[PDB]
Structures are given as structure tokens and as C-alpha cells.
Design a protein around this ligand. Structure first.
Ligand SMILES: CC1=N[C@@H]2[C@@H](O)[C@H](O)[C@@H](CO)O[C@@H]2S1
Ligand SMILES: CC1=N[C@@H]2[C@@H](O)[C@H](O)[C@@H](CO)O[C@@H]2S1
Lengths: 597, 620
């Protein structure tokens, strides 16, 4: 490959990208042109390539390397969105380690994204605030800089997303006057407390070390704001006016460092509210609605409050171990259309990691590529081709990663058997009324097999599929094991009961142990160590609870127990097709109390 | 002579504890004394109330183990003495264990046995209320009352009609969620809630007892949740009373006479939301209270004060509201695996003085089970005997002798069960200090309670405690299981208490020798000890309690063990040059809390999830 008209930065950028795409031996004249977002015209080895914004160069490289795998080229793209971002969750225990950010950045550049974002509640370090990020693998000064300089190498912008009021639970739990006197109630900060605004200066001082001056201050919906220690200290007061007062301060502080802020639309007296509108850009986030009409309605409502407005679509990796690229696809197609129709200039793909961040960071590349293709092409013609160029796997192959979520009974958001079938108890299976083993067992077994095959097309992403394979395997047996223990018990089939206890549940422990190793592997590749411990604890307990099932059945079989109380209890519906959406661990694993004091 | 079939059937069953000699007594109730025994091998025994017979037996048996001429007269200070077992923090006392408790309470002189049930009794038509919690059936409750009444002990259920219903409210189904204000609190002024509260008293109406504790403690965001969104801002002490009136009228349809915890009055009417305050009763409340104070007993609860004065000042604040007042004292069994009978003794002495000085009619001794009910149900009998002693004699002269009668152990000995909490440099007057628990559940790689350990003094204390308990185990009788559990525990705590520091110190100094030994030898020894302890703990649990709830502790230790395996693995991988640094080991450890920041390093830390991990286990 000999490209003309390129720079030194572009060349070093393209050297790293060589580790992803295989460039052909061709003459290529690269030049910046406003003509279109991306353009390529050529034949017989010589091809002229153009881009408006420099980061489009790297997607153009992916488009070229693709076409020239077959044909000897007429390509033109007119991008819909001025900005296209992906936002990694780094506050739910999964802290994306620095080597994984780079890879991420690399992939994103080839994809067409202009922006990279990290969501960091307490998970960046702040001078003179030792409890903030304490043992949570918080990013340091230099770490955030390294990551941003790397995004700079591809002309991709970095944007930290933080929280200036609520969603700081990991921080506020620490019982020291320094932390506790910053608190309103639950996860929220004490509004009006000068010490709280000291910390908010802290937040910005640290972020000002960066080159970016774009930030998401957060300021999401926190229902008890003003209602806890605020009430004791100050009496009943107008909660809308309390919120504004706070937002006014935070924005003044940002302006001190010259930050231009964004915040979640959730919060949005009126003269207070119309004044602070001008200073900020609201993000309407929606990961659920399945129609263009429902989005167009919501856009219309946010346009009544403000037109300075970005959209936050979603790549579903916040429901346990297994993402949902299939659902993501469905909502992106519909959101893009509504974003387009409503002149939305900015789109943020969010990859939250609710309840422990157990889904792999890279599991959502399809969803990312989908949004990229929607933006530049307005359709999914080049999706798989460009995707296989970018990852070395077909997008249909890659999306089978979802399988542990794809029960046939099921399109609609967040049915997550991947997680609730895995952490459910054995002796006390409270999700049992939501299994159809007639349908679920053979589905899970087939997935294991499929995923096993795909592990082998998967390259340096194989670790993802190896984990899902092992998972699905566990679920095909585990989905009804407890039900089978009940049916055996209720028929006094001690023979079968023995088989399960003596042979089946220890296998399950091995399989689960096996799962833990692969998961631990996945985690340390992708993330810092910190947070993993939560997972240790949770499967430790699952495993020990498997030992209980074994021990309780043996004492019975040995005549040392008259009944077995657990199995006597009649299982109710866990919540209100049979499946459902249960995504809190402590509540899947037991009906006992584990958080109450 | 003088006895009945009931009483003679009761004294028969008490032979399982009290070793009766070959003599002969003559029984007669009399308003003369609480108890009187007089005679020189033929004796005249009396009681004011029928249950006091059974403490008079413990007495007769004790005094006639060294002498033959006896002359006793006891004049008890409280119309009623009660013990309340927490059956809502995962440990549901099983029926055979309840029978046992009742017997002992009867010997000790207790008038009243109580079960604290947030949701741990079955209501017809609330299938989720008690679901997988081991909630008592109708049969079971009837069986426990009937047995309490075999000895003439009043049974008094303790329930919740406002807050502390987490277990119940957990369930994401419409018929439950519709009942909810915020966190663990029910929605005042919603009728589905009053429908539920109707059934609570109905389910209880099957019993002979028409005496109830309705709860209403610790509902701090009451009125500030889904209530706020539908009703807006309302005076909260008014709202509490509104709710109170509703619930008493409901109790009245079945003829119950109610008690409630007193804290919320003060919290809602104080200026910094505190319990220990003289308060300004808003006028719309005063009027409301005036009515309702005639129909409900407020129970002042306090476990923490080393002085009669401080209790006194609190009683006097309650006199603003009402003079229909009971006291609640503490048998400390809610701070992990290990009770605190020493401390319980120390504060009972003060609270007795203050209760008498405030002419208190009833004392309730309470055995809460904060955060999983891991402490053993029978671990606090000394404290029960101590309260019994301070009620009937107003001193502790009989305590050792009577306790040895009733249990087969010397109270001095039984009280060593505390040893996991009694660090030497602790002054005896501070509540809640619970290394027993947090030294156990602290992570290896990330010991976040570490600036609170003093190995120099902690390792030996645990070591010599394991030996001490071991011996006491050997003499404890049918209570050996309690001390078998405590011994193994200290065995574990002796090494666990600084293993995280040591790992850390070697790694920072590059002592690969010591990383090696710990990972290969110490840690798997630790795991093995913990596996035993778990088996010992389960034995204890399944002796005292129903199976349900044990699963929370399975989960917790299972998780501890796995965290030990990590420490093994991560170190093995470092030693082999696969990793360039154990990042865990490079975090400068901070103080966990400055609650007791004070010349000792120990502290109070009684939440499993924040002990075991600085990560989120709980939030989204
Ligand atoms: C703003 C938003 N705040 C919430 C996030 O904390 C969650 O991670 C996400 C997925 O549950 O849903 C909303 S989006
Ligand atoms: C009534 C009371 N409500 C609380 C209980 O739930 C706790 O278990 C106990 C011990 O912490 O303290 C108070 S007393």
C-alpha cells in the first residue's frame, strides 16, 4: 500500500489500524474534501479517497479494504449526524482497562464514530478526596490522559460523563465525617452545602487536566433530592427550585474551567428553568420504544423544553452476562429515523452495565456498527461486509452472542434468562414458573454448540464466545434441575434424587467453576481487577448453595430428616410466553434478606 | 400438694432442666409475695401469679443443694417481664427450640414470650407475605402459644404495620408494589394497605392472646415517597397519628390491646430527627395524640447508655407524650456471630435503676438479629437471667447460682461466649464493637477494615479464647454447640486478623518467600477452617431455627471462600511472572469509619455487604 497526500499522524494512525484491517497493495490519493463525509472513486490499483472530517479517513480505509477484496470503486457517504459517540459504563464495577480503551478507540474509528465516552460516577481520581474511587479501580490523571491522547491519534474526541448530584452510591457509603457531611439521602449529595461544591470543583479541576472541554454532568432523575438530611436541615422547599439552585452552581463551576456541559433530560421556577436551559444541552435517552411514532412524540416534547438536544440510544449490555444486540438493532433502526426526522445533530450509544457489569465490554460491536451504518448510509447494506473487515467475523455470527437471551417464546426489552436462570437457587428456585424446559433446555444446549462453532471463527474475540458457550451449557441443565428435584422428591424416587445429588449437581459445580475461570479471563482482558470480587462472591455463594442442595438431599436420603422444607413450598410467580425481566442479583439468588439491617 | 394437672404436667417437663430432689412441697397462690418458699424435707411454697411457680422451683432446687432450712420472699418490681426473639432477620426459631425457650423463661421468671415477625407468619390471601421465609403456619403459632400457656406464660406477637417490611416489599408483583410508600415502608392512607393490616390481626385473632406489639419503628422517609407524589406535603407527625388511629381501630374489631415502638414520634417532632429529645408537639398532633395515647402503650427502647441519668432524661421526654410506657432492654445478639452478654449486663444495671425510678410496669428484653440473624438464639441466656434477677430481687446475688440451676453452667463461664468481641484495650462501656464479624468477612486481597486491627493484641486474644471456649464447650452440656461454634470462630480470627496485612507487607517489600507460604500453605488451611465453621454454624442454625434464611449465610461464606481462592490464584500468577503487579495490594488502605475515631483501633461495622467489598453488590 502506497497512499499519497497523507500526513505523519495519519500514517502512524494507519500503522496501528494495520493490526485490524489488511490494506491492499494499491495507489491511493487521500485528500480532505467537504464534498461528502466520505468519498472513494477508482479503478486498476489507483483510487482517490476523500473525507470531510479527519476521523472519517479511518472508516474510509475500512470501506476501501472491503470493496477491493472483490471489485477493482464508486463510494459516496453523506453522514446524518455531526457527532456519533459511544459511551462505556465504568461505574458499575467494570472499569475498562487502558489497553482495552485503545482497542475500543481503534474499532470505533474504523466504524465512523466521532467520539468516545466513559461514564464515571466515583471512578476517576480527585485530589484531596481519597474515598472517591477508593479500591474501585478509579482512573488516575495520567490514565485518562493516555486514553484521550490515543483518541486524538484518530481525531476521535473524548468526553467524560460524571455525576454532580446523584448516583454516587459507592462514594457516599463511607462512614467518615468528610464524606457523610456531603450527603442528602441514599445516593444523593447535599444541595447547598459549600463542602459539596468544594468536591464539585475537585471534579472539574481533575477533568480540566484533559484537552476536551465537553462534559456530561449527569444530573439524572433522583426522586428523594431535598427529602433526606436536606429536609432535617432546611424544611420543606421547592424541589424544582432546589434542583436549579444546584445546577446554577455546577454550571458556574464548569465555566470557571471553560467546560461546555451536557446533562440527562430526566430533571427537566420556570424562570429559573428557562435561564439554565441556555447554558446546557439536554440528552433524551431511550432504549425501549419500538416505533418511530413514539420517538417522534418524545422528541416533540423535549423540543417544547429545548432544541439544544442530543439523543442517547442504547447498546444493550446491562442485563447480566449476555447482551442483546438483536433488540438494540430493532431500536436503532427506529430511532435513527426519528433522529433524522427531528434534525438531531448528536447521537450517543450508551453501554450501561447495571448491577455489576457482568456483560463483556466488546460484546456489543454489532450494535455499534449498526449505528455507524445507519448514520453514514441510512441503511444496513454494508453492515456485515464492513463488520467482517473490522472484526474478522460476520455480523450474523457475532450477534449469536445474544443466544442466552433469545428464548423462542419471545422484539421487546430485557427479558434476561441468561442471568436469572444462572443465579437462581436450586433448593428454592423462585424463577421456576418462568421456565419452559420443553422450549428452554434444547434451545440452551443448541446455543452452546453454535457458540462453540463460532468461538472458532472469532479470532481475538473468541474469549467472548467461549464464555457464552459455557454459560448456555450450564443453563440447559440448570433451567429445570430444581423442578426435577421437586418432581423426584414428590414421587419419592430416591434413585433419581440420588443420581441428581451424587452425580448431577457436582457436575454443575464444575461447569460453573469452569464458567468462573472463563469469565475471570474475559474480565481481566477487558477490565481492571477491581469489581471482579463482587462476581467471586456471587458465584461462590451460588456454588455453596449448590452444596446445600447436595447436603440437604443426602441427610434426607439417609433418613435423618422427615421432610425437606424447601421443596414443600409452592412456587409463586417471581414477577408480573413465561419469561420475564429480573435484573437484581440479591433478589434472584434468594427470597431471604441480604441487604436489610 | 395444691397442684393441678397442668402445673404437674409442667413440672414434669421442667425435669429436663431442673433436677428435682425427693422432698414434698405444698402450693398455694397468695397476694402476699411474688414468690415465697419456707420449710425445714417438707416445704410451703407460694406465688402471686401461676408462672412464678416455675421460678420458685429453680429457687427451691438451688437453695436445697447446700441446705435444708429455706425461707425466701421475692417481691418483683415489674407486672410483666418479656423476652422477644427476632424471627424476622432470617433466623426463624423452630418449634422445638421455642418450646425450650419458653421452659427456660419460665424457670427464670419471665411472664411473657415474644416473636418479632415482620412477615414471618402466614396470612391467608397474602401468598407473598412470608414466601420462602419459613413463616409460621397457623398450626405452628397455635402450638407455640398452647405451650407458653402450659406454663401460664403470655404469648405476645410483635409485628409491623408500617415499616421494616423489606422482605415482603421485595416482590415485584402489583398486589405488593401497590402497598408501598418508599424503601421498606407501607403507604399510609391506601386501603389495600389497611386490607392487609386487617388480615394481620385476623391471622392473629386465632389465638387466646389479645395483646400485640404493632411496631411502627424506624420509618424515616414516611410520607416522602409515593405518598408525596399523590398527597403532596403533609405534616408527618400528624400522618403517623392518622395511621396509628386507623390501625388501632382495626385491632379493636378483634379486641387486641396494642403496644408500639416510640421512636417515630420523637424523630418526626425533633429538629435534627433524633430519638433522644424533648420535643415540640404541633397542635394538630397534640389533639390527635390526646385521644390515641389512651389506647396504646409506647415502648421506649434503648440498648446503649452506660448511665441511669441518660435513661432518666429519655423517660421524661416520653412523659410529654404519654404515661402509658414500657421499657425495652437489650440482650446483645445482633452484631455478627458473637453476642455481648458483658455489655448487656452493664446496661441492664442502669436501665433497671431508671425503670424503677420511673415506675415502669413492663420491661421487654429484646434479642434482635441485625443483618442475617447469625448469632445463636440461645447465646444470651445470662442476659435473660440477669434481667430476671434484677426484676425479682433487684440484684445479682442469685445470678450465678440460679443460672447454674437452669442451664448447668456457671454464668461466668457461659459469658466467655462473648470472647470474640472483648478485645482487651476496649473500655467495657461502648456498644456495637464487633470484630467477631468483620474480621471474619473482610476480603483477603482488599482488607478494608485493616487500620482497625491490632495483631500484636488480636491474634493472641483469639488464640487463647479458642482454647478457653474449647474447654467450656467440653462442659456446656446440651449447649456445647454454641461454644463449639465460637471456638472454631476464634481459631479462624487469630490468623485471619492480619493475613491481609502480611500478604501486603511481603508484596511491597518483595518477600516472595512469604507470598509463597501464605498462598500455598496458609490460605487453603484458612479455607478448611472456614468450611468446618460453616458446618458447625449450620448445625447450630438447624438446631435453633428453620432451614429458611440459612441460604443468605451460605451465600456469604461461599463468597468469602471464593475470595480466598482469588487471593491464592492472583498471588500464584504474580509469583510465576504472569502479572507485573497485584494491583489490589498497591492500594493504600484507609480507615473504614471514624464513628469511634478514641485510643483503641477496633470499631463497629455490621453490614455484611460493606464489610466484604468496596464495590457495588447492591445498586444498579
Ligand atoms: C440516564 C440513565 N440512567 C439510567 C442508567 O443508570 C442505567 O444504567 C440505564 C440502564 O438501566 O438506564 C438509565 S439511562
Ligand atoms: C424497635 C427497634 N428497631 C431497631 C431494630 O430493627 C434493630 O434490630 C435493633 C438493633 O439494631 O435496634 C432497633 S430497636
Amino acid at each position: 500500500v502506497r497512499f499519497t497526500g497523507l500526513s505523519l499522524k495519519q500514517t502512524q494512525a494507519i500503522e496501528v489500524l494495520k493490526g485490524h484491517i489488511s490494506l491492499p497493495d494499491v495507489e491511493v490519493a487521500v485528500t480532505q474534501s467537504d464534498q461528502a463525509s466520505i468519498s472513494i472513486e477508482g479503478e486498476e490499483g489507483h483510487y482517490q479517497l476523500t473525507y470531510r472530517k479527519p476521523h472519517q479517513l479511518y472508516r474510509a480505509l475500512s470501506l476501501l479494504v472491503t470493496v477491493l477484496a472483490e471489485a477493482d470503486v464508486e463510494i459516496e457517504e453523506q453522514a446524518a449526524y455531526e457527532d456519533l459517540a459511544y459511551m462505556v459504563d465504568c461505574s458499575r464495577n467494570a472499569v475498562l482497562n487502558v489497553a482495552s480503551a485503545k482497542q475500543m478507540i481503534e474499532i470505533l474509528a474504523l466504524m465512523g464514530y466521532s467520539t468516545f465516552e466513559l461514564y464515571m460516577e466515583d471512578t476517576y481520581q480527585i485530589e484531596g478526596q481519597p474515598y472517591f474511587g477508593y479500591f474501585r479501580g478509579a482512573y488516575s490523571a495520567e490514565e485518562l490522559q493516555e486514553i484521550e491522547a490515543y483518541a486524538q491519534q484518530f481525531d476521535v474526541t473524548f468526553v467524560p460523563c460524571i455525576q454532580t448530584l446523584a448516583h454516587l452510591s459507592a462514594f457516599v457509603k463511607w462512614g467518615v465525617k468528610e464524606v457523610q457531611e456531603l450527603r442528602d439521602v441514599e445516593d444523593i449529595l447535599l444541595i447547598g452545602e459549600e463542602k459539596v461544591y468544594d468536591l464539585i470543583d475537585g471534579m472539574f479541576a481533575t477533568l480540566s487536566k484533559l484537552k476536551t472541554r465537553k462534559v456530561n454532568i449527569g444530573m439524572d432523575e433522583a426522586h428523594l433530592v431535598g427529602l433526606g438530611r436536606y429536609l432535617i436541615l432546611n424544611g420543606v422547599v421547592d424541589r424544582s427550585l432546589l434542583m436549579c439552585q444546584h445546577l446554577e452552581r455546577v454550571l458556574d463551576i464548569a465555566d470557571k474551567y471553560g467546560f461546555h456541559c451536557q446533562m440527562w433530560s430526566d430533571m427537566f421556577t420556570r424562570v429559573y428553568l428557562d435561564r439554565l436551559k441556555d447554558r446546557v444541552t439536554l440528552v433524551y435517552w431511550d432504549y425501549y420504544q419500538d416505533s418511530e411514532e413514539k420517538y417522534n412524540r418524545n422528541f416533540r416534547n423535549h423540543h417544547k423544553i429545548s432544541h439544544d438536544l442530543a439523543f442517547a440510544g442504547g447498546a444493550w449490555k446491562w442485563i447480566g452476562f449476555t447482551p442483546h444486540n438483536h433488540f438494540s438493532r430493532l431500536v436503532a433502526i427506529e430511532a435513527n429515523k426519528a433522529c433524522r426526522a427531528n434534525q438531531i445533530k448528536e447521537v450517543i450509544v450508551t453501554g450501561w452495565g447495571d448491577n455489576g457489569g457482568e456483560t463483556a465490554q466488546f460484546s456489543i460491536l454489532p450494535s455499534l456498527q449498526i449505528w455507524a451504518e445507519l448514520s453514514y448510509r441510512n441503511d444496513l447494506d454494508g453492515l456485515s461486509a464492513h463488520f467482517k473487515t473490522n472484526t474478522g467475523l460476520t455480523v450474523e455470527d457475532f450477534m449469536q452472542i445474544d443466544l442466552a437471551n433469545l428464548l423462542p417464546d419471545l422484539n421487546l426489552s430485557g427479558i434476561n434468562p441468561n442471568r436469572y436462570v444462572f443465579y437462581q437457587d436450586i433448593l428454592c428456585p423462585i424463577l421456576d414458573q418462568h421456565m419452559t424446559p420443553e422450549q428452554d433446555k434444547p434451545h440452551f444446549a443448541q446455543a452452546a454448540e453454535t457458540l462453540a462453532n463460532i468461538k472458532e471463527k472469532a479470532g481475538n474475540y473468541a474469549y467472548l464466545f467461549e464464555t457464552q458457550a459455557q454459560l448456555n451449557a450450564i443453563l440447559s441443565s440448570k433451567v429445570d434441575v430444581g423442578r426435577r428435584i421437586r418432581q423426584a422428591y414428590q414421587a419419592d424416587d430416591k434413585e433419581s434424587l440420588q443420581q441428581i445429588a451424587r452425580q448431577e449437581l457436582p457436575e454443575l459445580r464444575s461447569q460453573i467453576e469452569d464458567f468462573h475461570a472463563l469469565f475471570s479471563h474475559q474480565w481481566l482482558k477487558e477490565n481492571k481487577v477491581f469489581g471482579l470480587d463482587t462476581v467471586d462472591i456471587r458465584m461462590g455463594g451460588l456454588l455453596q448453595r449448590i452444596k446445600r442442595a447436595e447436603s440437604r438431599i443426602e441427610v434426607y436420603l439417609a433418613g435423618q430428616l422427615d421432610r425437606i422444607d424447601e421443596l414443600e413450598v409452592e412456587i409463586l410467580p417471581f414477577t408480573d410466553f413465561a419469561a420475564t425481566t429480573a435484573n437484581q442479583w440479591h433478589t434472584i439468588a434468594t427470597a431471604s434478606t441480604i441487604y436489610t439491617t
